[PDB]
Chains A and B, each alone.
Chain A
Amino acid sequence: QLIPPLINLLMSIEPDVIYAGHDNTKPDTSSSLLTSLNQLGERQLLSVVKWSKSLPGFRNLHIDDQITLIQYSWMSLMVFGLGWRSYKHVSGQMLYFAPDLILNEQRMKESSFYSLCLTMWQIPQEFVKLQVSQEEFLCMKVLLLLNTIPLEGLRSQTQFEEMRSSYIRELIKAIGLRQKGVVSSSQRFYQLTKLLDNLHDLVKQLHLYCLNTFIQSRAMSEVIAAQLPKILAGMVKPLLFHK
């Protein structure tokens, strides 16, 4: 009678803490950090796929849509979770990848990818500024999974639009928990959805950085042909809340 049932179910299906399995007793090296991010990255993906299987409405979508949605949004889901952990565990002052893989300013600058750390750091800073709540976060994260579809749409297009509409209504309830006023709660909805709309740009920055990091690992045209649709505009269809 305080928190909505669906927001509480989201919190309960929230995956457990995931470790990177990184050894912090040894001096960092460009490769050991990249090796750990990839290990942690793969674990979190299995975690996302699993989390989705308990998401009301997801499994009812055609299996091909489930795959597509995960493919299109795993990067945004992960960078969003990164922001959330950074925001709550360390006041958005550092990047909290995992309990055993935290990078503060110094460690960022001296990590092989400092410019990528600042880009991702943007999300936690916003959280701090907006003082995002847990209920708001959970609803926002579901929307990220439902923020990009194929230019031709999905097989379960109607079912998909109805699922997304519910979580949009749920986000408003979450906002209503603290933002009582009609104009205020209306204003926060704008701030939170505007933020989500902004992730479309930041996300391709990350896919691009991912690909380049890969190019440098081995020193090919086919690998670059399947990555461009994740870093380039005009191949998928982002669902923006604001024109």
Chain B
Amino acid sequence: LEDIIRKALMG
């Protein structure tokens, strides 16, 4: 999920 919780933070 590290990629999901990462694209979400930077939006």
Contact = CB atoms under 8 A, between A and B. Distances in A.
Interface of B is mostly: loop
A71 interface: yes
Interface residues on B, range: under 10
B10 to A, nearest CB: 8
A66 B9 contact: yes
A74 B1 contact: yes
Interface residues of A, number: 13
Contacts of B2: 67, 71
Contact of B6 (A42, A53, A67): A67
Interface of B: 1-2, 4-6, 8-10
Interface of A, helix, strand, loop or mixed by DSSP: helix
Contacts of A53: 9
A103 B5 CA distance: 28
B9 to A, nearest CB: 6
Give 3 nearest A-B pairs by CB, closest first: A49-B8, A70-B5, A49-B5
17 contacts: A42-B4, A45-B1, A46-B4, A46-B8, A49-B9, A50-B8, A52-B9, A53-B9, A63-B9, A63-B10, A66-B9, A67-B2, A67-B5, A67-B6, A67-B9, A70-B9, A74-B1
Contacts of A70: 5, 9
Contacts of B10: 63
A9 B3 CA distance: 28
